[PDB]
Symmetry: C5
Subunit: 256 residues, 5 copies
């Protein structure tokens, strides 16, 4: 529909990570990782699989102000609790005899989105013959083509802690009413590098000065913040994730 | 000679996904190469077709037109699709140690794209001129020792998909007057892959004088190579892994003298 | 606080400060180091020694009172810019004392591994949010750590809010600056984790950070005080034996301030 | 050398292009672009490297159209390393990374350097070891002392012969080269990954603060390069330097001088 | 008071490194590093300690007859001989059987300054109980506090080859009349990364448009360029240093 003239409120929210949480005391961690399954019998357990975080954020009803819609203009966001990884005394395997614990390191994924509706996602699989567990939503009727680009695998990030990170990326051919940003760093011993500052703002307005338009007086925040692998004294490995903070500035926009 | 920009229906967007062409050794390993061999003498180097990753290319047809009118490519949005699929450490990859997770994809990688008004122009360079390339590949014809450095005979068009091996060919900086190309190669056993996705990033394709690629025959050419690293199997065999690349291109009608 | 016009002089002032690090100080001779790090404590049995936990540094700098009376425009000090650097980085080029040989007949092992470089400047104490690796850790007397933690303290638990109101008491491993508050401060930090991460530290008297927000307003010093805060964990020192210690260094601050008018 | 006005109108601009080959040592007719195997652990008192083990600076004089006063002025250069994807061949020659693995990538110490000047590059000599005995066909610092291992102002030369000046003996001289522009990056290490970019969208302006470029004496332009990509590890454990060609495209204009 | 800009001279100098020079032949190298000395008994040899380089450059007298001083406006600088490190055939331990020699690598420090008086140093020590050798100038009467900040340790860089790099840094609380720039990179395996170009200039003017002012007609250059460690065949290690070029553009400035 036709976007018209601008006619200014802040929302803030703290999205928890969904790393698998194998029992209550391991909130923020996945189950121990399995290794060396044949592509032809790869059946990962639910609690081993990090999933995308999402929340529907209700916004003030605009009935007392064609229509009006909230417009997202800017967001400030950071990963919460980065210094917790300076605890090298709890749970982690010694680097060597008499040494402290092994830092969280290895492959990591840091990702956020702000939109006027659920994030649109595309499925890609490492191994199309993976049997995903109950409580996950993964590409339906995958083929070999699902290990590169198969355009049947389209979804909405419409449920929290359901869509595994290894199965889904944001869809660049859609997401007209959202902005998203992500960096993947892969490797056995990659160091995590995380920055905090209250002086960083991201602008959400497009080439024509229009931010995401909030449908049904709601916005969707999305995140995945896999910080790396935690190595237990036994040699077992677990994903560790951290919460993400969002502060979103919005203004009223007339539409038709 | 390039004249005036034109100004209803003087703008068009086209979008597509290019699939990677890494070798596809069997019906279930689409997006991977055959296991890499090692330590072949220069005198007896005969790589199998399915071990060799190839440049991806496609020709996108644009609406016909008629001091000629041509479509001009102004901006591109591109990312690699499926970067999170590397967070599956449970399938096929060798354990990092006893009781450990699978080894992540890592090692030598190459990220490349191009947008042109005609096929990408390539220069051939070889690690080993005596390498014997298999049927189904197109490689520098009749190379010499000189072909291991610069040999100006090795000129080709990226004019066929899944045929031009990445290890044999580079974009030619002495040509490609009607195209824009971007590439980064990172070599090493342990190189971490580092990949960014956002729908807010745009490359401008216009040159110093405000002209983008002009599409001959109302056709646009997209080119890619996205080798993400090596997958290490439980046995210790390694394979290339690749991913698809998204393109969105904004074009505009431009007038040209005959 | 409704903000009005910048005054112009006798309108401008500069304060400077050297903040020492609080790495734990295990004995009289090892100022700037932690106790030997322990390893492999079960989450159900994790009681770290006071001297093993580096803490945030903080200092309160007194400023000149500006108001003849408070009876309906106040003057306040506004922080505009800061120069800051880590003091003594070249001390890590001592490879002859205490550090394990890299191999037979080799130099000592450089300081390396996980590090955290953090600073802030505010018109009030830094506001902090608690997050724990392990909510079952038993923290020692003389530290201030998240009260009544649950499993949610391993992710985000909005109950863990604190003021950095005391030097050498808030452990770096329990607390981050709170991006949901600190309306009247500016903070900057980088965490780099890994067993063999190289330290990369720059010194120059030519670098300035601007503390003004989008509206051109800097931190406003309530009660004629400026709060500086730092954490500079440089990495891990590996002794002959194989035991490791955090090493930390002091941070310089030079802050320029101007007189700003406010309503009330 | 008094500089006056930039000349104007038709035929006031020219454009030269050059593919400069690397000079890595070429130990036999088939190993064009490599060095001889690296020796190791020679005492400083008895260090006598074989010529084919020593990479040298590349250079060429490019002759320009005769003008006579007018001189050609170099204003821009586009430059690129050629064949960077050739390092994705891990099947030929190189030591396997482990049992059943691919070949070991080229990695380690690397040097990427180019220059554009209106006369030969001016160079300063600096030795790791002043007692090194250099072989026939190489040009190295004369009568070096222990001071040659730091700064000896005696060691001035012109880059006036291709494949003669060893890269280990010479650096561009920042106290001279008023009539040239040089750019280099040294990365040292046993395992450093090579990182190389290609794009036809990057230009270096060669104009100084006053807006003056290299003025081309005796209607000559001097290009210079060193592109040591890293070390190739043969399956026996021997190592060789691997070099690549460098492309130049230089835009020039006529400048008035008295 | 700093008055008006009155014309122009250029000074140049190549400042040698001071790495320890253990014998006549090993100019530009330290003595083999010792390891594992107790804090309570750490007595390093003179020839093992790299020191700061400095030189006072004499300028033309201005006020033979508002007074005039020389103002330093720009500097071009680079490290000289970076390519010498491509000699892997001399002295260095092989990387493996039949392999080339081990490149120089590990901890490095690259620093320069330009002032109109001597560089002002602050003392900080790894180990305050270190006993420093004759021929060096180090913090007087140090305490534990000398391992962090101890304001007693102030000194002018007044003597070439005397102030050990490991004991001193530029003082950011002082040096109103100099500009300094330095990077430390620590670690066993750190690669040296060095750039050369005759097209890079550092501007030395401050916020108010004023460069360093040469107090009594002299300009002071300071440097330390520790490139990393050379590993001999035996396994022993020595610092390697390189000279630094400076070209400094100066202009006449009126003062009170
Ligand atoms: Cl699906
Ligand atoms: Cl050909
Ligand atoms: Cl609390
Ligand atoms: Cl000479
Ligand atoms: Cl002192």
């Amino acid at each position: 529909v036709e976007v018209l003239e601008v006619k200014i409120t802040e929302v803030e929210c703290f999205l928890n990570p969904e790393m698998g949480d194998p029992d209550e005391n391991l909130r923020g961690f996945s189950l121990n990782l399995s290794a060396e399954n044949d592509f032809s019998s790869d059946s990962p357990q639910r609690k081993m699989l990090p999933c995308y975080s999402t929340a529907r954020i209700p916004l003030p009803n605009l009935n007392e102000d064609n229509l009006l819609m909230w417009e997202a203009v800017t967001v400030q966001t950071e990963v919460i609790g980065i210094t917790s990884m300076l605890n090298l005394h709890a749970g982690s395997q010694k680097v060597h005899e008499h040494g402290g614990g092994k830092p969280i390191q290895g492959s990591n994924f840091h990702f956020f989105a702000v939109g006027g509706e659920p994030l649109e996602m595309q499925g890609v699989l490492m191994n199309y013959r993976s049997k995903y567990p109950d409580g996950t939503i993964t590409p339906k009727n995958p083929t070999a083509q699902s290990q590169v680009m198969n355009t049947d695998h389209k979804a909405y990030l419409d449920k929290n802690n359901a869509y595994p990170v290894e199965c889904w990326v944001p869809d660049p051919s859609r997401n007209e009413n959202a902005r998203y940003f992500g960096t993947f760093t892969g490797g056995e011993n990659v160091p995590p590098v995380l920055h905090v500052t209250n002086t960083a703002t991201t602008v959400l307005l497009d080439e024509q000065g229009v931010g995401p338009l909030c449908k049904a007086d709601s916005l969707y925040v999305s995140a995945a913040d896999i910080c790396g692998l935690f190595t237990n004294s036994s040699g077992t490995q677990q994903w560790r994730g951290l919460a993400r903070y969002f502060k979103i500035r919005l203004r009223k926009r007339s539409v038709k």
